[PDB]
Amino acid sequence: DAEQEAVAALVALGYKPQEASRMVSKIARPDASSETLIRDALRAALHHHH
Amino acid sequence: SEDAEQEAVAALVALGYKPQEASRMVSKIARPDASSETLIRDALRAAL
Amino acid sequence: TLRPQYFKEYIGQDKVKDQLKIFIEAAKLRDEALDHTLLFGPPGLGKTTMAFVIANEMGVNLKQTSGPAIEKAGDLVAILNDLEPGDILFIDEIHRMPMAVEEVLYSAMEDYYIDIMIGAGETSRSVHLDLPPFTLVGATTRAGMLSNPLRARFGINGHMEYYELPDLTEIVERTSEIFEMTITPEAALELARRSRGTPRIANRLLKRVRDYAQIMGDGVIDDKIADQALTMLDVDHEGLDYVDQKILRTMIEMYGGGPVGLGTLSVNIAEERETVEDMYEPYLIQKGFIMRTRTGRVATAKAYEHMGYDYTR
Amino acid sequence: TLRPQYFKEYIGQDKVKDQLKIFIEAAKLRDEALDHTLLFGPPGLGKTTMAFVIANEMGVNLKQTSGPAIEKAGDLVAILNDLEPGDILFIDEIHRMPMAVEEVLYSAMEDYYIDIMITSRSVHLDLPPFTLVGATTRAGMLSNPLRARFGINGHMEYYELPDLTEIVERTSEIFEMTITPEAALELARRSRGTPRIANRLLKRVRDYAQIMGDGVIDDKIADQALTMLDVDHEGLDYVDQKILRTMIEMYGGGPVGLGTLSVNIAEERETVEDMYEPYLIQKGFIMRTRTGRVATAKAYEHMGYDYTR
Amino acid sequence: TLRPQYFKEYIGQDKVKDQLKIFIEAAKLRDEALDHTLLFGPPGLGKTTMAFVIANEMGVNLKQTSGPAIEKAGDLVAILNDLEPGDILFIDEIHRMPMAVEEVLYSAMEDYYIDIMIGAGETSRSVHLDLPPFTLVGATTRAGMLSNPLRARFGINGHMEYYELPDLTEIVERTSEIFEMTITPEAALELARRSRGTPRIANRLLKRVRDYAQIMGDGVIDDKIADQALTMLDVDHEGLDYVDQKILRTMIEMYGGGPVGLGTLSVNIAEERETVEDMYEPYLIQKGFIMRTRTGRVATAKAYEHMGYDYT
Amino acid sequence: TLRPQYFKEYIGQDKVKDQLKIFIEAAKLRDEALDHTLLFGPPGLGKTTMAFVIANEMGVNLKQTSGPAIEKAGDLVAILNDLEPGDILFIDEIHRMPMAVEEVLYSAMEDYYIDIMIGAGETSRSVHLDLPPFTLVGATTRAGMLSNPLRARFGINGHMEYYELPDLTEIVERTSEIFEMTITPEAALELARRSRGTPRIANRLLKRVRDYAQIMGDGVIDDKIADQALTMLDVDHEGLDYVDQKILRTMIEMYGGGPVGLGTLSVNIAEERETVEDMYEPYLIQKGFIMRTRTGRVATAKAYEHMGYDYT
Amino acid sequence: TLRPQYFKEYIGQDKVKDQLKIFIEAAKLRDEALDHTLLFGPPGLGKTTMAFVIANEMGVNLKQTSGPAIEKAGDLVAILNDLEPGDILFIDEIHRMPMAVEEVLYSAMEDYYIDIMIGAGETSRSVHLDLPPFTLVGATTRAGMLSNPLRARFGINGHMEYYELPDLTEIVERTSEIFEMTITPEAALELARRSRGTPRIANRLLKRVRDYAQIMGDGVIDDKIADQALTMLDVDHEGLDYVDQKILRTMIEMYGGGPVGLGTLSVNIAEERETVEDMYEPYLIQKGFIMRTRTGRVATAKAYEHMGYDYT
Amino acid sequence: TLRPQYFKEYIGQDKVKDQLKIFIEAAKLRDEALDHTLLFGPPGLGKTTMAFVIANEMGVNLKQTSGPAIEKAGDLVAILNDLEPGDILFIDEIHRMPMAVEEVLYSAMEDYYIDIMIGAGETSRSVHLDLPPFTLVGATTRAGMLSNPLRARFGINGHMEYYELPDLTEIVERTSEIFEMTITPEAALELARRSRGTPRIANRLLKRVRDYAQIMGDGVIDDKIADQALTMLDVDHEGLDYVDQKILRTMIEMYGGGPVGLGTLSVNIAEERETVEDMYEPYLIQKGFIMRTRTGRVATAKAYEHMGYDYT
DNA sequence: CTTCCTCGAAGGTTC
DNA sequence: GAACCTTCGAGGAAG
Ligand SMILES: Nc1ncnc2c1ncn2[C@@H]1O[C@H](COP(=O)(O)OP(=O)(O)O)[C@@H](O)[C@H]1O
Ligand SMILES: [Mg+2]
Ligand SMILES: [Mg+2]
Ligand SMILES: [Mg+2]
């Protein structure tokens, strides 16, 4: 159920449902929570710079 | 060469070019061994 | 061509022309490019013409484009790659550049490089493109709407000004020599006096007098022919049109100088509100013939003495 | 036809007509194209008519468009691509073109080339020598950089009684209706100085003579027809007379405010100011003052009242 | 029906009606379309009604639309070119068209053609579109809001005027026969004199009297029922409403006739400044009960002899 | 429920009720929809409540919306498309509608149709939307803002009046029974004299007194509880607030009753110029405490005795 | 946490607390919600805190939003559908809510139902929502910026005033007890007088003086330290802010004391009109530094002797 | 140095710099994050530079972004998720971010967590995310433009201000060494005076004088050369630019010092009226050359004597 | 970018 | 000379 919850949370943050699905779908961890997924889906998409 | 090909195409996309047109622009370059800088330089140069 | 090509030929603008010469000579005394330059002034004073002279005097090639023609970062970057060491890039109406491109120029001007960021997360990387030294020259008519971070990068400023009778006359003399027509110096002075200090107006008047002189005369512009031509046209010796005279005459004869509102004046001369405020009123203010007040327009003593009517406070 | 075709047919406008003849002859003698011309002035004076006469006198084929139709640069670029050497492009109501399009014109007028971006791509055009003619009623609405590029400015003026009399007779012969010289003069006085208004009266008077008369316009029919239309010999309408009468008999000549006067005649405020007062002020029947407007001595004599300062 | 259909039935407007008869007859003898017509003037005087009468007398089909509906040039360009030779186009509330759309009519009205841009991209091209002979009819309350170049193109101008008591009495009697009620000639005049000169108001009063006569009466309108019903509506023999009477009374009893300012008068009657100046004051001035002066409003002698005081 | 549901429960407004009864009964006999009606006047007097009563007496469903909710003509067309034969449409704050949408009702009210443009935009044409029979009810606080052509189409006009003490007292009693509270007739009269003639104010005071009377009273609204509770709420025995009292007191102690100008007085009370003229002064004039004069305004004898000073 | 949570902890505002206690208690005997309440006055006096206290005393949940955060009618519908029976909705900056949305609150407050149109084109349809009982608490910095239709629907009003020296002293002593800190009575009284009568300023300054007493002292707040710390900050002996000093120094020097309008002054001091009118002007006027005049504000003699100028 | 790392190396801003030192080390003694800090003042004074110094003195890695770079709430949450305990987040033009961000930033700054609500009707849940301690540093060009409830969360205010003559001479001297230009103390002071308080202007003038002195002299910037170079640049000894002299010179010769309005003035000299009242008038009024009378601008006595005109 | 409208100034009368 | 009333004119924020 955390899969849909994470996507629903990202939709609230302004991500499109299609992109939120693709973003969350890139991550895979059956035991991850909606919170730990969100903390990963965002880190994977933000462009870090040095 | 996929590293330079992907970098040149992705960097060209960051400049506002469309993915298709960016692919065509880079696809016109022959030399694969040249660096992304040379690839983007020539790609932008040819489109001028 | 009509446009001058070198400082030796460029008439007037001695203030800006004198300053630029010192900066250009100091740049040549070093293996360096000229500082970024911005040109200010009203329409029609040579802002376009001056850019070419700077390039020729620098011994460099000139690249030319316009603000509206640039809409994506790649446009500017692609043009910037074309620049050889020391090349001059001229951007017209630089104030119309979109923010999407305006924001890219800062690192170019200050560091001569662009650093294109790409990727995301662990794939986040950037590519650094070295740019050869160059000098950006901008021209604008509405400087007040530029952003402050851009204005902070320009190191040289030039304010254009209206030409004056001793030099505006020489532009008529020279232009009359491109056509195959002889003109007396006294006639050229009469044309300059009415050109409002603007080169385009002087050239337009000369073309109109040329047609008359070769159809209603012997094809020579003497003082006698000039008076007839300038009598067929409405332009008075102060440069006032027929309607300009009608406005002043109306205010003095019917309202005793005012104050009078814009709407009331428009219906008396049978013109649109927008036309009197934009076509005719601006020059009357600069010449000092009328003032604008919270209660309406009012005529000044300077206007009374020109029309030839008695004046009393 | 109603529209004159050559300067020999064009009555009046002696100032503008004289200048255009000199510049047209000089251009032909040099085999060059005429400079860009701007025509402006009040409605109904002849701006559109003069544009066609210029083309006929130059001996060229005229391209015609209008400002409201040009919505995007692609529209104007297609039109400009069809121009050949010496062609004349006429744009009516030029004040409506979006300023995004005027900026494309700044360079095309001076250097005769177009180098612009237009699914987006670049486009380049080299233009042959051509003459642009613009006509507008709101000249002040054009940008200062555009007005500075026009080389000829023609400002239209109102006509005089002798010119209008000659125009009325010319139009009467097209309708093949007989009219006397003194009858034609009585219509001219009522035409407010405008050729279009003079033609409108003639059309209405003709309709009366065909139904209530013998199909001939004479000093007797004209007086009856004009009384049915209720147009004074100074050209004042029924409502115009009601305004002056109300001011003299209820406010002693004024001053009175626009709001007070409008409600007293049962008229809308915007209609009195924009449709009736302009002619009364230009003829000198009313004057505006800081406290209101007052009827002048000319109004008293016309209405038949004893003036007292 | 409640709207007249021919000049035989259109009572009043002698000036406008007489002119249209001559111009319509002349147009038929020459076998050509009627010139463009603009109808303007106060509300409820018969502008819309006359537009249909013209179409019937000309014997052609009438196409109808309104200014508020036309919002872009595409709409007007589509209405045009759907016209047949001799059609009549009627636009109501013509003052609402955008000025960018009015300027398209300039060529159509004078020269029967319009310039259009067609296609896209490289196929973009201009073309002339040519129109058959037609007559445009406009109706508006705000003629001063139209552009000067547009008003100059209308060839016929009709300014409507208020009706007189003989004409209004006949209109009431005609309407009384569309319904099934008998009305005495003496009672018909009693309504006409209270209708402020407007046909719509005369019809409204009759409808209200009909409802009273068939509830509190025997279904017939006579001087007795009319007098009673008008007492319930509280409309005096001059047409003054309840609030109109209160204004005049207060001016004569507290300020001795004035001068008094609009604000001071509004607060004393518990009305607001805008309702008094826009709803009630306009009719009181046009009928001569109030006079406006630099110092304020003043009650005239006609008001004193109407309210029953002495003009000392 | 607080809102009256039928003409038998609706206290006051005798002039408006008497007329509406006759017009509603006559409409039923003919089996037709009721004519359009406009309700206007001060806030809180019962305009919205009267609209619901009319719907119940006619026996139809009431659709409800408001002027400021409509922003473009598309919204109005959607609302009218939902109408069913005989429905009543109530529009609150009708004067807030934009003029461009107000002019669309002109045809709907007189002829029951609307001109609408249809099609994708490349090909399009106008068509008549035909509306069923319906009754429009409008309510507004300032009828003077409506255009003349709109006001002329309403067939019934209802001007609301402030309530008198006899009727306003019955409203306080009626409300007490719904709240299951006991109130002595002397106490009901006290609340009425302080309610400025407005039912909305009377109900608000009763709710606050009821809370006080049961927390530190003995559960009954006696004449002594009301006096204490109304002191806490800061409502004078004439309905004046502390700001109103400050104005009157200053005029008596610092100017001997005036005359004094509005600008001078406003500064002496630390109040904004326009607030005093629009928010506080109107009630003081209507009640007779202040009088405007050509040289300023003066406090009358009534204002002196109410404060206890000596009149001279 | 510093925020009080019950009426026993909330210091000051005796006039407001006394009324809320009665109404909240009376609303507990009956099993119903509290009436809608409007709180207004200067910023930082504690009106947001009162909303939390009201919720805790009733024993219900609190939801919080602001006028600017609601952009369209659909936003409010989503919020109102998420309220349980008896919940409290708190709306800050209520005076900035969009007019098209404010019209929807009137119905929800007065009748507890919402009529809304949903969908588009042929799918456009109405919805009727029936809401559970709830209490709206509104907060505004401007007493008179609300519309009269809105202000009339609130059943309870509370004007909040600046705190006096004894109250702020107790608030400073309480705050210095939540933090691990020690303060002498002499220092607490000094800091209170310096705190512009505002609790938010008092708490903010205490946090800063605490830091100075540790680095530049022995970790204890004494009058000798408090004086130095407050003089290192810009806080004047009278508590005037840097903005306050600019205002007074500009009026006395650029206008010779005035009069000057606050509108033109706003742009000369480079401060937003609404901030200077609502945050700063009220204190300077209420404490006698600035006085009102017909033309505008003028600096009093007290201001001249404070800034050290000569009262010429 | 010109690009300092620690406060001892930073030139000027002694007031702001002295306050930060106490707060920075005080936070270290308690081993906790620093309070949120708001920097404000004119542009180009060194706000961005100071943010790096604060990070070094704390001993933390700086993270940087800007208001316009944030477009949706998720953007900020992502950045905040990438934070490490003690990190400092710098936001330039913090007032430009959309309100949808501020709604989340509040609880982030105050509670160090965010609670994204989800579900509707019978479904209602949230996701609760823990955040490590951090310090927010914001910089703006104005104070009043910041959201009121946001401005209350910042605990430290840093008012930046224009540099004094001693500081500018030191900056000029350091910059000259980078160019390898030899400049005497008198020449450095002359440039400092005319740079009118801003380092960017001081750098620009020095570069230009270098070019002149390298050609019109021996590469040594002497006082005699510096004064000649400045007259060639047309820079007045009071720091008035070319256009500034034109405004003053125009008022004296064409209007006798005025009064004259901004509309007329902006038309006489070919300029955009906004530019004059925004760029040039502020410096001329602050220095006492121009006064903003209600009738219009007027030239003061200083301007007459400064420009070299005999006063009236 | 434009129209509306509202805020301000001032002419004139009276006590 | 203080207080009322009417009329005109130019901005600016709500479309
Ligand atoms: N009576 C009081 N007792 C204790 N603390 C108070 C009191 N009033 C306000 N405060 C404190 O001061 C601050 C006031 O903030 P808030 O109540 O939000 O102000 P407002 O809502 O008026 O803008 C809070 O920190 C609050 O705890
Ligand atoms: Mg140029
Ligand atoms: Mg034409
Ligand atoms: Mg009609």
To test ligand 1's pocket by mutation, which of G2, G3, G198 has the most ligand atoms within 8 angstroms of CB?
G3
d(CA F162, CA F200): 12
Per the CB < 8 A criterion, the answer to whether D225 and D205 are in contact is: yes
Position C157, amino acid: N
Q: Which residues contact D179 (CB under 8 A, 6 or more apart)?
A: D168, D169, D172, D217
Radius of gyration of chain B from its Cα atoms, rounded to whole angstroms? 9
- Determine whether the interchain pair G115/F232 forms a contact, defined as Cβ–Cβ distance below 8 Å: no
Kindly state the DSSP code that residue G290 receives in the 8-state scheme: E
Pick from B45, B1, B43, B6: nearest CA to B21: B43
Say whether the CB atom of D286 is under 7 angstroms from strand J: no
Resolution (A): 3.2
d(CA F137, CA F156): 10
d(CA G290, CA G277): 13
Sign of CA dihedral E197, E201, E207, E208: negative
Chains G and C touch (3+ CB pairs under 8 A): no
Helix (H, G, I), strand (E, B) or coil at G297: strand
F57 φψ region: left (φ > 0), alpha (ψ -120 to 50), beta (else): alpha
Strand I near-CB residues (< 7 Å), G 241-300: 261, 263
Position C3, amino acid: R
d(CA H127, CA H112): 14
Annotated catalytic residue D35:
no
Q: Which residues contact G9 (CB under 8 A, 6 or more apart)?
A: none
Say whether the CB atom of C225 is under 7 angstroms from strand J: no
Beta-carbon neighbour count of residue H149 at 10 Å? 14
Bridge partners of F125?
Answer: F118
Helix (H, G, I), strand (E, B) or coil at C297: strand
Per the CB < 8 A criterion, the answer to whether E181 and E220 are in contact is: yes
Kindly state the DSSP code that residue F86 receives in the 8-state scheme: T
Please calculate the CA angle D229-D231-D233 and round it to the nearest 5 degrees.
140
The end-to-end CA distance of chain D, in Å, is 53
Q: Which nucleotide is nearest to F274 (CA to C1')?
A: I7
d(CA B32, CA B2): 9
d(CA E66, CA E96): 9
All residues of chain F having their beta carbon less than 8 Å from the beta carbon of residue G99 are 68
Chain F touching partners, 3 or more CB pairs below 8 A: E, G
Instruction: Give the CA distances from residue H261 to residues G261, H273, H292, H295, in Å, rounded to whole numbers and listed in that order.
Output: 19, 11, 10, 8
H237 φψ region: left (φ > 0), alpha (ψ -120 to 50), beta (else): alpha
Query: Which two three-digit tokens encode residue D216?
Result: 């001939």
To test ligand 1's pocket by mutation, which of G13, G17, G39, G49 has the most ligand atoms within 8 angstroms of CB?
G49
d(CA C258, CA H262): 20
Instruction: Give the CA distances from residue D189 to residues B19, C101, D177, D192, D234, in Å, rounded to whole numbers and listed in that order.
Output: 74, 64, 20, 7, 7
- Determine whether the interchain pair A39/H127 forms a contact, defined as Cβ–Cβ distance below 8 Å: no
Pick from H270, C254, G119, G26: nearest CA to F219: G26
d(CA H191, CA G174): 55
d(CA H308, CA H311): 9
- In this complex, the residue of B10, B16, B45 whose CB is nearest that of residue C73 is B16
Pick from D144, D130, D142, D105: nearest CA to D35: D130
d(CA E13, CA E54): 14
Per the CB < 8 A criterion, the answer to whether E193 and E237 are in contact is: yes
Phi and psi, residue H225, nearest 5°: -75, -40
- Determine whether the interchain pair C117/A47 forms a contact, defined as Cβ–Cβ distance below 8 Å: yes
Beta-carbon neighbour count of residue F191 at 10 Å? 25
Bridge partners of H126?
Answer: H117
Pick from E155, H66, F13, G151: nearest CA to D197: E155
d(CA H95, CA H75): 17
Domain-wise residue ranges, chain A? 1-50
Q: How far is B18 from chain C (nearest CA, A)?
A: 11
Structure-solving method: cryo-EM
Of the residues H14, H15, H28, H48, only one is catalytic, namely: H48
- In this complex, the residue of H77, H117, H125 whose CB is nearest that of residue A42 is H77
Pick from D173, D259, D257: nearest CA to D217: D173
Nearest ligand 1 atom, CA G12? 1
Cβ-in-10-Å burial (0-12, 13-18, 19+) of E154 comes to buried
Bridge partners of C137?
Answer: C37, C90
Say whether the CB atom of D290 is under 7 angstroms from strand I: yes
Q: Which residues contact G197 (CB under 8 A, 6 or more apart)?
A: G162, G163, G164, G168, G283
Pick from F222, F280, F279: nearest CA to F248: F280
Helix (H, G, I), strand (E, B) or coil at F126: strand
Say whether the CB atom of E147 is under 7 angstroms from strand I: no
The helix (run of H) or strand (run of E) holding residue C88 is: strand C88-92
Cβ-in-10-Å burial (0-12, 13-18, 19+) of G285 comes to middle
- Sheet of G135-140: strand order equals G62-66, G88-92, G135-140, G37-40, G156-159
Kindly state the DSSP code that residue D12 receives in the 8-state scheme: S
Query: Which two three-digit tokens encode residue F307?
Result: 């404060």
How far out from the chain centre does Cα C271 lie? Answer: 28
Nearest ligand 1 atom, CA G3? 27
Bridge partners of G88?
Answer: G62, G135
Of the residues F63, F87, F96, F141, only one is catalytic, namely: F141
Place of tokens 């519309």: G147
Beta-carbon neighbour count of residue E3 at 10 Å? 12
F40 φψ region: left (φ > 0), alpha (ψ -120 to 50), beta (else): beta
Pick from C98, C97, C90: nearest CA to C39: C90
Beta-carbon neighbour count of residue C73 at 10 Å? 20
Please calculate the CA angle G2-G7-G11 and round it to the nearest 5 degrees.
60
Please calculate the CA angle F183-F188-F189 and round it to the nearest 5 degrees.
150
d(CA G164, CA C168): 76
Helix (H, G, I), strand (E, B) or coil at H89: strand
d(CA H88, CA H94): 14
Kindly state the DSSP code that residue D116 receives in the 8-state scheme: E
Kindly state the DSSP code that residue F277 receives in the 8-state scheme: I
Instruction: Give the CA distances from residue D274 to residues D157, G49, H212, in Å, rounded to whole numbers and listed in that order.
Output: 21, 60, 64
- Helix residue ranges, H only, chain G: 14-29, 47-58, 73-80, 99-111, 148-151, 165-178, 185-193, 199-215, 223-232, 242-254, 262-269, 273-275, 281-286, 301-307
In the structure, how many helices (H) and strands (E) does chain F have?
15, 9
Instruction: Give the CA distances from residue H111 to residues F211, G1, H148, in Å, rounded to whole numbers and listed in that order.
Output: 39, 11, 19
Ligand 3 center to residue D98 CA distance, Å?
A: 20
Helix (H, G, I), strand (E, B) or coil at H116: strand
Q: Which of E83, E92, E208 to mutate to test the interface with F (most CBs of F within 10 A)?
A: E208
Query: Which two three-digit tokens encode residue A21?
Result: 């699905």
Position C8, amino acid: K
Query: CA of E255 and C1' of J2: distance in angstroms?
Result: 22
Does A44 lie at the interface with C, CB-CB under 8 angstroms?
yes
Bridge partners of D292?
Answer: D289
Q: Which nucleotide is nearest to C296 (CA to C1')?
A: J9
| Contacts by G273-276, CB closer than 8 A, 24 or more apart | G274/H144, G275/H143, G275/H144, G275/H148, G276/G243, G276/G247, G276/H144
Pick from F18, F109, F20, F94: nearest CA to F56: F20
Instruction: Give the CA distances from residue F10 to residues C29, F2, F52, H52, in Å, rounded to whole numbers and listed in that order.
Output: 99, 11, 11, 74
The helix (run of H) or strand (run of E) holding residue G296 is: none
Position G134, amino acid: F
Beta-carbon neighbour count of residue E217 at 10 Å? 15
Phi and psi, residue G90, nearest 5°: -110, 125
DSSP chain E: --S--STTT--S-HHHHHHHHHHHHHHHHTT-PPPPEEEE-STTSSHHHHHHHHHHHHT--EEEEETTT--SHHHHHHHTTS--TT-EEEEESGGGS-HHHHHHHHHHHHHSEEEEEES-GGG-EEEEEE----EEEEEES-GGGS-HHHHTT-SEEEE--PPPHHHHHHHHHHHHHHTT--B-HHHHHHHHTTSTT-HHHHHHHHHHHHHHHTTSSSS-B-HHHHHHHHHHHT--TT---HHHHHHHHHHHHHSTT--B-HHHHHHHTT--HHHIIIIIHHHHHHTTSEEEETTEEEE-HHHHHHHT----
Any atom of ligand 1 within 6 Å of the Cβ of G3: yes
Per the CB < 8 A criterion, the answer to whether E113 and E122 are in contact is: no
- Helix residue ranges, H only, C69-184: 73-82, 99-102, 105-111, 148-151, 165-176
d(CA D225, CA D236): 15
Chains E and D touch (3+ CB pairs under 8 A): yes
Sign of CA dihedral H267, H270, H274, H280: negative
Cα torsion D171, D175, D176, D178 to 10°: value is -70
d(CA H305, CA H238): 13
Tell whether omega for the bond before D4 is within 30 degrees of 0, i.e. cis.
no
Any atom of ligand 1 within 6 Å of the Cβ of G40: no
Bridge partners of F298?
Answer: F291
Say whether the CB atom of D143 is under 7 angstroms from strand I: no
Radius of gyration of chain E from its Cα atoms, rounded to whole angstroms? 25
Query: Which two three-digit tokens encode residue C147?
Result: 């952003």
d(CA H38, CA F42): 50
Helix (H, G, I), strand (E, B) or coil at F35: coil
Per the CB < 8 A criterion, the answer to whether G47 and G94 are in contact is: no
Phi and psi, residue G255, nearest 5°: -130, 10
Strands (E) in B1-48, as ranges, are none
Chain E touching partners, 3 or more CB pairs below 8 A: D, F
E308 φψ region: left (φ > 0), alpha (ψ -120 to 50), beta (else): left
Per the CB < 8 A criterion, the answer to whether F112 and F161 are in contact is: no
**Beta-sheet pairing, G88-92 with G62-66:** parallel
Pick from D190, D169, D183, D186: nearest CA to D217: D183
Tell whether omega for the bond before H259 is within 30 degrees of 0, i.e. cis.
yes
Beta-carbon neighbour count of residue C28 at 10 Å? 13
Q: Which residues contact E33 (CB under 8 A, 6 or more apart)?
A: E27, E86, E133, E134, E135
